[PDB]
Design an enzyme around this catalytic site. Structure first.
Site, PDB file in Angstrom:
ATOM      1  NE  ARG A 138      -2.754   0.766   3.277  1.00  0.00           N
ATOM      2  CZ  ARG A 138      -3.655   0.363   4.157  1.00  0.00           C
ATOM      3  NH1 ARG A 138      -4.959   0.363   3.869  1.00  0.00           N
ATOM      4  NH2 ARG A 138      -3.239  -0.029   5.348  1.00  0.00           N
ATOM      5  CG  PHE A 164      -0.854   9.059   3.926  1.00  0.00           C
ATOM      6  CD1 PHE A 164      -0.336   9.432   5.175  1.00  0.00           C
ATOM      7  CD2 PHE A 164      -1.986   8.264   3.902  1.00  0.00           C
ATOM      8  CE1 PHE A 164      -0.895   8.934   6.344  1.00  0.00           C
ATOM      9  CE2 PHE A 164      -2.548   7.782   5.070  1.00  0.00           C
ATOM     10  CZ  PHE A 164      -2.010   8.123   6.295  1.00  0.00           C
ATOM     11  CD  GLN A 178       0.353  -0.460   5.667  1.00  0.00           C
ATOM     12  OE1 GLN A 178      -0.431   0.385   5.278  1.00  0.00           O
ATOM     13  NE2 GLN A 178       0.009  -1.361   6.581  1.00  0.00           N
ATOM     14  CG  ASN A 236      -1.509  -0.055  15.228  1.00  0.00           C
ATOM     15  OD1 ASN A 236      -2.691   0.141  14.917  1.00  0.00           O
ATOM     16  ND2 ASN A 236      -0.729   0.876  15.840  1.00  0.00           N
ATOM     17  CG  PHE A 242       3.528   3.806   8.101  1.00  0.00           C
ATOM     18  CD1 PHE A 242       3.007   3.059   9.178  1.00  0.00           C
ATOM     19  CD2 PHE A 242       3.557   5.195   8.222  1.00  0.00           C
ATOM     20  CE1 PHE A 242       2.594   3.669  10.339  1.00  0.00           C
ATOM     21  CE2 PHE A 242       3.100   5.811   9.383  1.00  0.00           C
ATOM     22  CZ  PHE A 242       2.607   5.054  10.444  1.00  0.00           C
ATOM     23  CG  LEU A 292      -0.814   8.405  11.533  1.00  0.00           C
ATOM     24  CD1 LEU A 292       0.106   7.639  10.595  1.00  0.00           C
ATOM     25  CD2 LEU A 292      -2.198   7.736  11.568  1.00  0.00           C
ATOM     26  CG  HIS A 341       0.247   4.129  13.834  1.00  0.00           C
ATOM     27  ND1 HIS A 341       0.067   2.910  13.215  1.00  0.00           N
ATOM     28  CD2 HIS A 341      -0.952   4.753  13.782  1.00  0.00           C
ATOM     29  CE1 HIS A 341      -1.186   2.807  12.806  1.00  0.00           C
ATOM     30  NE2 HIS A 341      -1.819   3.912  13.103  1.00  0.00           N
TER      31      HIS A 341
HETATM   32  O1  LIG Z   1      -2.638  -1.594   7.686  1.00  0.00           O
HETATM   33  C1  LIG Z   1      -3.248  -1.592   8.751  1.00  0.00           C
HETATM   34  C2  LIG Z   1      -3.903  -0.350   9.238  1.00  0.00           C
HETATM   35  N1  LIG Z   1      -3.259   0.922   9.045  1.00  0.00           N
HETATM   36  C3  LIG Z   1      -3.771   1.806   8.209  1.00  0.00           C
HETATM   37  O2  LIG Z   1      -4.736   1.568   7.538  1.00  0.00           O
HETATM   38  C4  LIG Z   1      -2.911   3.040   8.221  1.00  0.00           C
HETATM   39  C5  LIG Z   1      -2.093   3.203   6.913  1.00  0.00           C
HETATM   40  C6  LIG Z   1      -1.481   4.634   7.051  1.00  0.00           C
HETATM   41  C7  LIG Z   1      -0.371   4.470   8.189  1.00  0.00           C
HETATM   42  C8  LIG Z   1      -0.481   2.961   8.599  1.00  0.00           C
HETATM   43  C9  LIG Z   1      -0.858   2.312   7.247  1.00  0.00           C
HETATM   44  C10 LIG Z   1      -1.827   2.785   9.335  1.00  0.00           C
HETATM   45  C11 LIG Z   1      -2.191   1.355   9.705  1.00  0.00           C
HETATM   46  O3  LIG Z   1      -1.605   0.690  10.515  1.00  0.00           O
HETATM   47  N2  LIG Z   1      -3.465  -2.681   9.511  1.00  0.00           N
HETATM   48  C12 LIG Z   1      -2.983  -3.997   9.153  1.00  0.00           C
HETATM   49  C13 LIG Z   1      -2.170  -4.769  10.153  1.00  0.00           C
HETATM   50  C14 LIG Z   1      -1.085  -4.148  10.746  1.00  0.00           C
HETATM   51  C15 LIG Z   1      -0.278  -4.865  11.605  1.00  0.00           C
HETATM   52  C16 LIG Z   1      -0.589  -6.183  11.921  1.00  0.00           C
HETATM   53  C17 LIG Z   1      -1.677  -6.812  11.286  1.00  0.00           C
HETATM   54  C18 LIG Z   1      -2.475  -6.091  10.425  1.00  0.00           C
HETATM   55  C19 LIG Z   1      -2.032  -8.251  11.606  1.00  0.00           C
HETATM   56  C20 LIG Z   1      -0.722  -9.002  11.976  1.00  0.00           C
HETATM   57  C21 LIG Z   1      -0.072  -8.287  13.177  1.00  0.00           C
HETATM   58  N3  LIG Z   1       0.264  -6.894  12.803  1.00  0.00           N
HETATM   59  C22 LIG Z   1      -1.034  -8.301  14.366  1.00  0.00           C
HETATM   60  O4  LIG Z   1      -1.173  -9.651  14.803  1.00  0.00           O
HETATM   61  C23 LIG Z   1      -2.422  -7.728  14.008  1.00  0.00           C
HETATM   62  O5  LIG Z   1      -2.904  -8.303  12.778  1.00  0.00           O
END
Ligand SMILES: O=C(CN1C(=O)[C@@H]2[C@H]3CC[C@H](C3)[C@@H]2C1=O)NCc1ccc2c(c1)[C@H]1C[C@@H](N2)[C@H](O)CO1
Length: 164
Positions: free
Chosen positions: A54, A59, A62, A101, A112, A121, A125
């Site tokens: 992504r 911005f 990721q 997260n 990211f 954030l 984060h």
């Molecule tokens: O991508 C995102 C959400 N997210 C956004 O949408 C915004 C975008 C803008 C700044 C960043 C990216 C911010 C972001 O984090 N979540 C997905 C994710 C992330 C970590 C983990 C997991 C899943 C799984 C495996 C492991 N770690 C844990 O076990 C939990 O489950």
């Protein structure tokens, strides 16, 4: 001292260059160590061969989902998830390196690199380092993203490791 690590990144198999990152082990040792080890691959898994899945221009870029390659996966060197260590470092500008997260205390391996100040954030984060060199490479990655986050070429971390 703090680790220096690197990511060598390609788009559609063509090399974009190297991003060098300082990991702030002085402030977030557990978080820095996780990233460092995932760069070297020394635990038997890590970022080599995985993608930036992504990328949103103006911005952030990721990456780090090396299990599912779609934003649902990744894992830490400690286990499937680990706590937010602290929120001492802030999202101050382009080049900030921070943990993705799925809510509180769900750090894994996704991360990211900011291409702008993402201060909304802060406190949510965990920031754990920054770009030392290769911001121009990050801008190349950013150019293959879109407002939706979907990339227009396959962006791959072909190699990664530790410089010091
Ligand atoms: O991508 C995102 C959400 N997210 C956004 O949408 C915004 C975008 C803008 C700044 C960043 C990216 C911010 C972001 O984090 N979540 C997905 C994710 C992330 C970590 C983990 C997991 C899943 C799984 C495996 C492991 N770690 C844990 O076990 C939990 O489950």
């Amino acid at each position: 001292g703090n680790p220096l690590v690197y990511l060598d990144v390609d788009a559609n198999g063509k090399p974009l260059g190297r991003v060098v990152l300082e990991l702030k082990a002085d402030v977030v040792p557990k978080t820095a160590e996780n990233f460092r080890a995932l760069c070297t691959g020394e635990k038997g898994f890590g970022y080599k061969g995985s993608t930036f899945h992504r990328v949103i221009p103006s911005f952030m870029c990721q990456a780090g989902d090396f299990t599912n390659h779609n934003g649902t996966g990744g894992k830490s060197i400690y286990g499937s998830r680990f706590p937010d260590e602290n929120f001492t470092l802030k999202h101050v500008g382009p080049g900030v390196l921070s943990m993705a997260n799925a809510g509180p205390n769900t750090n894994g391996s996704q991360f990211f690199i900011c291409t702008i100040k993402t201060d909304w954030l802060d406190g949510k984060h965990v920031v754990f380092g920054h770009v030392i060199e290769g911001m121009d490479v990050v801008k190349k990655i950013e150019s293959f993203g879109s407002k939706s986050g979907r990339t227009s070429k396959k962006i791959v971390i072909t190699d990664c490791g530790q410089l010091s």
